[model samples]
Target: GCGGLMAGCDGKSTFCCSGYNCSPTWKWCVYARP
Candidate 1:
């Protein structure tokens, strides 16, 4: 299970496995700090 805020690497696709609350299909990563 996820414990903290979910973040992903920029220019990459983040895949959320089944049984978790996620957007349909892999979510595109974004650089929140850059």
Candidate 2:
């Protein structure tokens, strides 16, 4: 559970269940589990 939508961080994280920080392109804070 981390972050991933449009831009996968250079750090490379986010599986699901929860995450945020979508680069300069803000979605407020979004995450969704599989």
- What's each prediction's TM-score? 0.18, 0.16
For residues 1-34, could you state the per-residue lDDT of candidate 2 as single tens digits?
4344554544444332245444434433345333
Clash count per candidate: 0, 1
- lDDT of candidate model 2 versus the reference: 0.42
Error of 2 at 27 (Å): 4.1
Q: Could you tell me the lDDT of residue 33 within candidate 2?
A: 31
Model 2, which residues run further than 4 Å from truth? 1-23, 32-34
* Candidate 1 residue lDDT tens string, 1-34: 2212243323344443332333223343222332
Indicate the TM-score of model 1.
Answer: 0.18
Give the Cα lDDT of each candidate.
0.32, 0.42
Highest-TM-score candidate: 1
